[PDB]
């Protein structure tokens, strides 16, 4: 907590800032493992938005995407970078089990006025970098663990 | 024939040769083959601006030894 809030992030593009660092994950966070149902991203947001610590709003968080697209997709560096078609993207993104991550963190951070950090973990479970979407500190952020470049778990910051 | 750096997702730079009269996807393909990663899983920016597949490399103000940043598309 104390340490993570002292991190100066490097600004990169849009509301994305970045850090390179090695951390022992268990020393700084507790992890709630999410199920492998395609929804981990939205489960983690649901779980992190509230002290009751449940993932059952995951559908609702997913259903924010069309509206966030209307507001932001035309200007999202990742969408622009990858040359994604808006209509193609919105139709897929609302389906149950469709994966998500960096683009939806960028849109939703803004849409909900929150800060989302995806912490990247190597094969051994050591945090090797992070992407922060927003201007908040980690102690206030929605912290997610990215595993095997294919899944996220929720992080609770430790005390 | 310009030499530049592409900083990878681990923060480490690798040297790529590039032609300002060629489009951005030429460099995508070079990175894709060399770093073993599909083109639709990453994008590139330069000085905070996203680079686009059919834009000419020369339009971005590239210089010898300048750094392009690789951005993985994160999905899970």
Swiss-Prot record, chain B:
The modification S-nitrosocysteine is found at residue 66. Residues 1-76 form the Ubiquitin-like domain. It comes from the Eukaryota. The record marks 73 as: Interacts with activating enzyme. It is found in: Cytoplasm; Secreted. Ubiquitin-like protein which plays a key role in the innate immune response to viral infection either via its conjugation to a target protein (ISGylation) or via its action as a free or unconjugated protein. ISGylation involves a cascade of enzymatic reactions involving E1, E2, and E3 enzymes which catalyze the conjugation of ISG15 to a lysine residue in the target protein. Its target proteins include SERPINA3G/SPI2A, JAK1, MAPK3/ERK1, PLCG1, TRIM25, STAT5A, MAPK1/ERK2 and globin. Homodimer; disulfide-linked. Interacts with, and is conjugated to its targets by the UBE1L (E1 enzyme) and UBE2E2 (E2 enzyme). Interacts with NEDD4. Interacts with PARP12; this interaction inhibits PINK1/Parkin-dependent mitophagy. This is Ubiquitin-like protein ISG15. It comes from Mus musculus. The gene is Isg15.
